[PDB]
Design a protein around this ligand. Structure first.
Ligand code: VML
Lengths: 120, 123
């Protein structure tokens, strides 16, 4: 038994990270702007153990993984850790969707998708 | 934004507005599902508030919850309390006395002996 968070009330708390799903279809840029307005970022995947709840996520949703032409990187500038995501090519694009279990789909940044914000 | 602590909950359970949830994909009939939650200081999902449990809009598939029909004809939770109105739309699927949760805020009537996935909730 432990106290989780802190997180805002309308967010799921899991191992002290906070997650919120947004059902609005938005492109990657608009989804990142949405998360920032909540004092958050798009989903960052850093650990299969600390984030094992991501195995239960259904459907595909924007996360904060982008390609600047260099490897894939998160919004915060950190590199994607190895052996964490299986990356699959889906569309011509520089952004990625999260899909269970621990997959990233390369996706056109302009394609509207639902999205997951994260705070910690 | 206002930061709150959530819980307390076991570390491997989801916390949402201080309730803790766990999903179980190993299928069990209703009673065995209840026994499994009990062994984890929990009960099957109890639905009491659209606002406090709005995360249930996102819970798909069909999972046992702790809702049973007593043939005084009442609908009750495992803890003995009543199903409150304006919370769930209840639909028959199989003749039975137990209910599966489905999105959004639906319950499907199901034979209590049918194996299904289930949701535990700390209580
Ligand atoms: C039985 N079951 C496992 C479901 O139905 C799952 N539903 C969806 O993932 C789900 C289904 N439609 C739309 C969105 C989601 C979704 C997306 C992101 C998250 C977030 F913000 F968490 F990232 C949460 C849900 C599920 C339901 C509740 C909680 C969780 C969990 F938090 F554990 F991931 C998963």
């Amino acid at each position: 038994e432990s106290y989780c968070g802190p997180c805002p009330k309308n967010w799921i708390c899991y191992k002290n990270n906070c997650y919120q799903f947004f059902d609005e279809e938005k492109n990657w840029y608009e989804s990142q702007a949405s998360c920032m307005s909540q004092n958050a970022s798009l989903l960052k995947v850093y650990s299969k153990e600390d984030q094992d709840l991501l195995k239960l996520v259904k459907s595909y949703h924007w996360m904060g993984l982008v390609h600047i032409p260099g490897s894939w990187q998160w919004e915060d500038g950190s590199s994607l850790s190895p052996n964490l995501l299986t990356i699959i090519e889906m569309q011509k694009g520089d952004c990625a969707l999260y899909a269970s279990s621990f997959k990233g789909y390369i996706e056109n940044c302009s394609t509207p998708n639902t999205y997951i914000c994260m705070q910690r």
